Design a protein around this ligand. Structure first.
Ligand code: NI
Ligand code: NI
Ligand code: NI
Ligand code: NI
Length: 385
């Protein structure tokens, strides 16, 4: 049984005939094994049983309330101040609540990108994640859509970890570039060369590979030729007749169809990685946002909770109960209760979760969730000391 003293609101749990003071309702439920609510009694009634030692986990949350919303939404945002200066400052926000997206803060379009720095190296950020880039040769990076005037701005450790590494911002290497083609094409069209065919939609460019030909967009055709033209002043025009017979392959160039547009960080200081998964979805969806401020409502902007011994300001609409999957380094499933102040507390297993009254956890991304300051693990074993 579980009692609350009417005079003091103090909790007591009855264990093996002794009343034990207990620090919080969370701890009481861990020791009882079910999400009990206290029975109110007059203070003097508690004198009728022998009093034992205090039990529970002092740093646990008082209880474990969770917010109604079923869709799991987690967003990490970097905001940079003094972006052009010698000393930019980055702030990071963790947002676990629905967003309000608009033209001032929205997903990067397929031809938009952000140039950033982290630990002395440079990366291109697109909708998909981050891509290594070497700014040593700016003629080369120009042909890959980066203007010579573009300068990187810093990202946070948290943002670097959250953005998936999608591979380098470069043309895929072509093995045997310069060697004669084995496809029956004219001798000038060596491996790694570009040609075109006229279509009703205009020119279609192709690159010659060891094992076939691959369609490339105009931007990629230009970048190929900028790096190595193989002696050709322009892509030779071939007839469909000669080409349709050749094996078609894929050439996985990262370059978008439209000329790349590089985001001005002084104008658009906010960069976010947004993740979401709804009940019953097979996989989550994520995207990168860019814009003027956090993707939250006018009034939500004032509700942030700074984690002083943490790294982020947290924006939450109530508690959360989440499941993570991470390679630590072996594949590990873990659960956390998140209190309404953004503190995460481990929940070791489903039996323990259910004793606390925490029904199915929501899948969430460890890259964002583990940025939250961690409190004590909520375990019966800890509670019973
Ligand atoms: Ni005892
Ligand atoms: Ni706005
Ligand atoms: Ni936009
Ligand atoms: Ni556009």
């Amino acid at each position: 049984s579980l009692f609350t003293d009417r005079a003091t609101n103090q909790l007591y749990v009855l264990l093996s005939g002794q009343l034990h003071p207990v620090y919080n309702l969370t701890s009481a439920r861990l020791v009882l094994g079910n999400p009990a609510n206290p029975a109110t009694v007059k203070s003097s009634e508690l004198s009728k049983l022998p009093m034992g030692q205090t039990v529970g986990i002092p740093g646990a949350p008082y209880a474990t309330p969770v917010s109604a919303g079923s869709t799991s939404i987690w967003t990490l945002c970097d905001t940079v101040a003094r972006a052009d200066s010698t000393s930019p400052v980055v702030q990071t926000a963790v947002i676990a609540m629905p967003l309000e997206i608009d033209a001032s803060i929205d997903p990067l379009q397929s031809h938009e990108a952000v140039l950033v720095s982290y630990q002395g190296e440079t990366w291109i950020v697109t909708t998909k994640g981050r891509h290594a880039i070497d700014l040593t040769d700016r003629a080369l990076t120009s042909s890959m859509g980066i203007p010579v005037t573009a300068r990187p701005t810093p990202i946070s450790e948290g943002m670097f970890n959250a953005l998936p590494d999608m591979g380098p911002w470069q043309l895929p290497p072509i093995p045997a570039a310069g060697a004669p083609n084995s496809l029956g094409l004219p001798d000038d069209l060596v491996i790694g060369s570009v040609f075109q065919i006229h279509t009703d939609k205009g020119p279609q460019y192709y690159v010659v590979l060891p094992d076939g030909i691959a369609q490339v967009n105009a931007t990629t055709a230009a970048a190929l030729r900028a790096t190595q033209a193989h002696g050709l002043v322009a892509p030779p025009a071939m007839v469909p007749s000669l080409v349709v017979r050749i094996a078609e392959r894929v050439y996985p160039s990262p370059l978008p169809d439209e000329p790349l547009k590089i985001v001005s960080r002084p104008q658009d200081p906010a960069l976010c990685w947004s993740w979401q998964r709804s009940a019953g979805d097979q996989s989550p969806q994520s995207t990168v946002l860019s814009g003027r401020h956090l993707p939250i409502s006018p009034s939500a902007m004032n509700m942030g909770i700074k984690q002083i011994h943490g790294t982020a300001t947290v924006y939450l609409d109530g508690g959360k109960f989440v499941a993570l999957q991470s390679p630590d380094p072996r594949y590990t499933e873990s659960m956390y209760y998140i209190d309404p102040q953004g503190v995460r507390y481990g929940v070791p297993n489903a039996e323990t979760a259910k004793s606390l009254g925490l029904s199915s956890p929501q899948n969430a991304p460890w890259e964002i969730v583990r940025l939250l300051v961690d409190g004590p693990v909520l375990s019966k074993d800890a509670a019973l000391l």
